[PDB]
Amino acid sequence: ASAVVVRVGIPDLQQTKCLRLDPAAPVWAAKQRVLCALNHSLQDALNYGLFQPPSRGRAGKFLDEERLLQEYPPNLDTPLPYLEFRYKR
Amino acid sequence: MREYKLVVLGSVGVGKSALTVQFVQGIFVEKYDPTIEDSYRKQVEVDAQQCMLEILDTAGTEEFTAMRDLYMKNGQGFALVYSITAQSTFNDLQDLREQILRVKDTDDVPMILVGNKCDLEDERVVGKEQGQNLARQWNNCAFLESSAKSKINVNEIFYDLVRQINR
Numbered sequence: 695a696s697a698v699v700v701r702v703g704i705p706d707l708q709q710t711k712c713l714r715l716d717p718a719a720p721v722w723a724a725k726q727r728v729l730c731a732l733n734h735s736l737q738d739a740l741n742y743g744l745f746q747p748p749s750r751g752r753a754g755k756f757l758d759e760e761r762l763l764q765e766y767p768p769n770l771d772t773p774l775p776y777l778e779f780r781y782k783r
Numbered sequence: 784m785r786e787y788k789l790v791v792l793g794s795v796g797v798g799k800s801a802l803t804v805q806f807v808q809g810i811f812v813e814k815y816d817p818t819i820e821d822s823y824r825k826q827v828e829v830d831a832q833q834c835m836l837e838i839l840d841t842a843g844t845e846e847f848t849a850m851r852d853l854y855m856k857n858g859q860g861f862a863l864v865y866s867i868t869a870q871s872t873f874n875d876l877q878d879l880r881e882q883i884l885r886v887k888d889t890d891d892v893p894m895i896l897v898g899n900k901c902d903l904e905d906e907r908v909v910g911k912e913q914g915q916n917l918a919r920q921w922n923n924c925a926f927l928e929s930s931a932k933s934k935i936n937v938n939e940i941f942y943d944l945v946r947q948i949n950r
């Protein structure tokens with residue numbers, strides 16, 4: 695089940711990390727990969743979601759957890775697909 | 784307020800990630816997680832001025848060489864880190880240094896040579912003089928022995944990169 699390398703901005707820590715995410719897996723499973731990468735440095739970590747920033751021809755949305763990852767096509771305007779980890783509540 | 788783009792480079796396990804997290808977060812990552820590419824922003828005061836540091840912690844592999852081109856183009860200052868406990872990680876610094884000069888078409892490149900893990904003194908293979916000799920070879924490049932575990936010479940790495948860019 696081969697992976698895809700994705701850059702994840704975490705604005706509340708002012709950091710970015712490139713992680714291998716599986717596209718044929720749920721979005722919650724990628725949220726969980728990001729939580730392990732943060733190594734318990736993010737307060738109230740369950741209240742954060744993966745968020746796709748607005749881009750050309752596409753408004754920004756929080757990604758839905760039930761849905762698979764590959765059902766969100768990456769914004770094609772960067773060498774590496776880009777996602778953000780933001781607070782929702 | 785100026786922003787400074789500093790790149791940390793060197794082969795795997797030398798402590799690129801541990802030095803960056805010690806500086807940015809004040810904690811020692813005693814685990815090893817392989818790095819693909821990790822950036823950290825942090826505002827510090829250097830020489831009475833407020834500086835935004837952007838620190839890229841890069842991978843120690845020849846994987847992802849496309850993004851290696853990217854970060855040496857845009858890097859303003861470079862920390863070349865070896866471990867004092869592994870001879871190979873030192874030897875492999877030389878090829879990196881020349882690639883930085885070739886993609887920047889100039890040798891006026893802010894640079895610092897770092898001997899990390901100076902807290903493991905009985906496991907030491909690379910002497911202080913070896914590093915001092917590479918440093919002088921390199922047109923009298925700045926040189927530090929550091930420990931990310933003991934927080935010796937950690938912030939000194941990034942602050943000297945900043946002062947060099949201001950120079």
Ligand SMILES: Nc1nc2c(ncn2[C@@H]2O[C@H](COP(=O)(O)OP(=O)(O)OP(=O)(O)O)[C@@H](O)[C@H]2O)c(=O)[nH]1
Nearest residue numbers: 796797798799800801813817818843900930931932
């Ligand atoms: N004793 C000691 N161990 C250190 C020091 N710095 C890093 N380490 C350990 O060395 C291992 C490698 O640390 P990393 O920072 O992940 O190595 P790296 O250079 O980042 O490797 P990559 O980012 O994957 O290319 C970890 O187990 C660290 O805890 C140090 O200053 N002293």
Ligand SMILES: [Ca+2]
Nearest residue numbers: 936937938939
């Ligand atoms: Ca210090």
Ligand SMILES: [Mg+2]
Nearest residue numbers: 800816817818
């Ligand atoms: Mg690492």
